[PDB]
């Protein structure tokens, strides 16, 4: 299995990019998970409103 280390590094770069992107938008996920915490359901309308 010589093809088990390419996919690991591909997912590693994907995770690194996702972390670097989520760091800048940390407030977005913060207010979003708080909104999910108070209001027990979360649709696309509340989703796009909370994207502000």
């Amino acid at each position: 299995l010589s093809n088990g280390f390419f996919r690991s590094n591909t997912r590693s770069e994907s995770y690194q990019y996702l972390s670097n992107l989520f760091i800048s938008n940390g407030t977005l996920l913060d207010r979003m998970t708080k909104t999910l915490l108070k209001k027990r359901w979360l649709f696309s309308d509340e989703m796009k409103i909370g994207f502000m």
């Binding site: 209001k39 027990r40 359901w41 649709f43």
Partner: peptide, 24 residues
């Protein structure tokens, strides 16, 4: 009480009244 019904769809669970036919 405790349920799994979203607050947006609560008002949709009631029956509205209706005006009687005014003309007769």
């Amino acid at each position: 009480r405790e349920s799994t019904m979203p607050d947006r769809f609560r008002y949709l669970t009631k029956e509205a009244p209706d005006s009687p036919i005014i003309w007769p």
